[PDB]
Swiss-Prot record, chains A, B:
Primary subcellular site in the record, as a coarse category: cytoplasm
Organism of provenance: Haemophilus influenzae (strain ATCC 51907 / DSM 11121 / KW20 / Rd)
Residues where phosphoenolpyruvate binds: K22, N23
Protein keywords: Cell cycle, Cell division, Cell shape, Cell wall biogenesis/degradation, Cytoplasm, Peptidoglycan synthesis, Pyruvate, Transferase
Modified residues (2-(S-cysteinyl)pyruvic acid O-phosphothioketal): C117
Cellular location(s): Cytoplasm
Function comment: Cell wall formation. Adds enolpyruvyl to UDP-N-acetylglucosamine.
Residues making up the signal peptide according to the UniProt record: none
Protein name as it appears in the record: UDP-N-acetylglucosamine 1-carboxyvinyltransferase
Biological process annotations from GO: cell division; cell wall organization; peptidoglycan biosynthetic process; regulation of cell shape; UDP-N-acetylgalactosamine biosynthetic process
């Protein structure tokens, strides 16, 4: 049980390299189950979830490994097992993405149903439903979702009840090998879905409209293989931009894709920051200024990302003025607020809305990481708080932030990873 | 990391002894900080939270121990330390109750602010506010709530913004030694508050209206000591009644206080059960019948208790018909639903409402305990599911259920506690 010791009162400035997106690499890795020929992935961050995914794949018969260059080589030519075991799946709800490819290509698959989650309900009803529409027969027995289709899946129009990144990806994946044309209406538009779509296309798939609420897929016999560089992580990028915005510093994020963070960049500018976007980098200069409070309302892409909500709660807590933060995606994603309040922040919670009252300076103390995005927010808070800050259950960060210690340290942060 | 192995397909019938209420023993234990003379508590369940509380007390200078009879002897005559340390408080948010007594009697106290919680936000703003109204000066520094009053607290009328069991108890405790008369309006009416009130009265306090939304307290110089038998646990009682109702069995709960479960008992009867209440026992005979789905709406006492919500979600999932369960107290208290769905249950979640569709039989599998009331619900589900069920993170039950293994086993359950 590791925990970070962070020394406060610091200005975070400098350069930081942005890695590939966890939420792109994950679905792409499961989508590789459809590949009949070799696959090579680059810009894949080293994260716990990637490792767990690899284990699930190997367990299905997929041969995969990361080489000395960091690239991930994957061969799914001889998959002979069709069950994503509970032992592994219980540690990563994203593995639900194993079901779609397996049924589509092998006409059978098994993945254990999701468990309870601290930030909110995470059912997969839309995933199951979408697959059934495509012709899959699904039975729920022994905690497993068991799909089976006596023949190749059948394209059709599916109108997803609500905007779901997960279900959009599952259905898109299965559609690739279905007979006929599939239309995914009211689809999520997230950049990770576009990237997964492009990945699939490189292997023969025929997907159009990815990134819009209207995705069209013309099923094909089978997918081949390819080499693909994972899309830069917009959330990691947004996080480091926040590092500068909350500390008066100036940070330059390298290897970015600015057009995936319009909502974030505009809120940062609204907060009083200057950000310049080039095709491969994004710079944020807070100008040694305290930020101005701004209202936040999370929403499906291209709106403000829920995955940046905790980071902006921190920005508003040190900003000048009152702010209204409305979380519309999940129902319990404010667990970071009490921890931040322990550090001197001020927020009043009511329903899915937090009304924050910015203060000039936070104070270091002990806090507990409750989730992925909250964990980084607490570390960042520790960087600008007076004195020392200790963050427990820091294992959460390793789920979405590659070498976060070195990267932050590279921006002037003084942080030591110790074991309690 | 222990976990329960439960063998399903069983009818739970028999007798079970009900212990004292965790939510009465806890506040009473912290209230004992006001005692200048010896205190003797009986019917105090052996729970992790009680142990942690004892540690906090000893750390303040209180001499306390449980003897061979099970009674808890406590001497708070020489308290010489006034800080409930974060090291301990971080493991039990209820320790916030240490602040009120300490400030009231010693005119100073320190307790660390609460952290994030999985079932919902658990701020203590109403606690702090109530104490300030009484004249306490409070500062938040280094993650601690530091109270101080240059003189004896001062009675006044306090209108709590919302119904809070915790804040009602904190203010009531401090009011006992304030100068003048204090009125707590819009107070929570829970049975545990009444019991704590009676406890305080036995030591000289002057509290009236406990159990109603209007509590009147006439401050006094100091409190003495006494012997007190903790009120029976209505939630534990409700839980075992559910054991019979979901399995077609017949259970008799001994050493009860039926008038604290009217809402629960009436819903059980609505579900098709026969329950007979005597002054010291409550019997539920399901009559070998499958229950009828009933709607649930949690609310402050005397309405349906949120602490029985998970238990009734299980009842409705095996019942006949559709049910609407509305949780109005906390915002993420449905983490048990996905786990139960893994077992065959069916529920659709939307906001603070779960629409369940009862099924005839659940199926055994692996599930994870997410919280206290959810953990027991999963164990109970395992008792009536076909085959075998394994419940992980079972350490949650030990927070509110004394010797739960023996008690359930005493009702016909086959359960083995093993270490993964
Ligand atoms: C591995 C990954 O990519 N995770 C991201 C993904 O998660 P995730 O896959 O859960 O995102 P979704 O957009 O699909 O769903 C979000 C909401 O839809 C609900 N829902 C989803 C599926 C379903 O079948 N039924 C249903 O009711 C969820 O309960 C939740 O309220 O999108 C979230 C919103 O951008 C991000 O914060 C996550 O980091
Ligand atoms: C140790 C103990 O006795 N725990 C019980 C107690 O908890 P607890 O003390 O939290 O109960 P409260 O009734 O005081 O409060 C419940 C609600 O009030 C809110 N709130 C509370 C205090 C405050 O200062 N500000 C505020 O906003 C909470 O966020 C929550 O939404 O009552 C709950 C409701 O019966 C039970 O489920 C808990 O098992």
């Amino acid at each position: 049980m590791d925990k970070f010791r962070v020394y406060g009162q610091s200005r975070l400035s400098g350069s930081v390299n942005i890695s590939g997106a966890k939420n792109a690499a994950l679905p792409i890795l499961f989508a590789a189950i459809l590949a009949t020929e070799p696959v090579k992935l680059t810009n894949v961050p080293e994260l716990k979830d990637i490792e767990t995914t690899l284990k699930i794949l190997r367990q299905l018969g997929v041969v995969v490994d990361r080489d000395a260059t960091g690239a991930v080589l994957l061969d799914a030519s001889n998959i002979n097992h069709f069950t994503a075991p509970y032992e592994l799946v219980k540690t990563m709800r994203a593995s639900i993405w194993a079901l779609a490819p397996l049924v589509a290509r092998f006409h059978q698959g098994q993945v254990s149903l999701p468990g309870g989650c601290s930030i909110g309900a995470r059912p997969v009803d839309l995933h199951i439903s979408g697959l059934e529409k495509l012709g899959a027969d699904i039975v729920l027995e022994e905690g497993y979702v068991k799909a089976q289709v006596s023949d190749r899946l059948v394209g059709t129009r599916i109108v997803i009840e609500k905007v779901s990144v997960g279900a959009t990806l599952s259905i898109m994946m299965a559609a690739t090998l279905a007979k006929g044309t599939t239309v995914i209406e009211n689809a999520a538009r997230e950049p990770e879905i576009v990237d997964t779509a492009d990945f699939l296309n490189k292997m023969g798939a025929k997907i159009t409209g990815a990134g819009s609420a209207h995705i069209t897929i013309e099923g094909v016999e089978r997918l081949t293989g390819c080499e693909h560089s994972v899309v830069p992580d917009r959330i990691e990028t947004g996080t480091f931009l926040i590092a500068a915005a909350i500390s008066g510093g100036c940070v330059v994020c390298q290897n970015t894709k600015a057009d995936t963070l319009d909502a974030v960049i505009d809120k940062l500018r609204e907060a009083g920051a200057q950000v310049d976007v080039t095709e491969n980098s994004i710079t944020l200069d807070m100008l040694g200024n305290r930020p101005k409070a701004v209202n936040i309302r999370t929403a499906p892409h291209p709106g403000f990302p829920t995955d940046m909500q905790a980071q902006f709660t921190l920005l508003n807590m040190v900003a000048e003025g009152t702010s209204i933060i409305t979380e519309t995606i999940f129902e319990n994603r404010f667990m970071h607020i009490p921890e931040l309040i322990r550090m001197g922040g001020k927020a009043e919670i009511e329903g899915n809305t937090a009304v924050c009252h910015g203060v000039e300076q936070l104070s270091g103390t002990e806090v507990i990481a409750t989730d992925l995005r909250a964990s980084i927010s607490l570390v960042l808070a520790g960087c600008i708080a007076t004195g020392e800050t200790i963050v427990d259950r820091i294992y959460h960060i390793d789920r979405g932030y590659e070498h976060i210690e070195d990267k932050l340290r590279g921006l002037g942060a003084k942080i030591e990873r110790f074991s309690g």
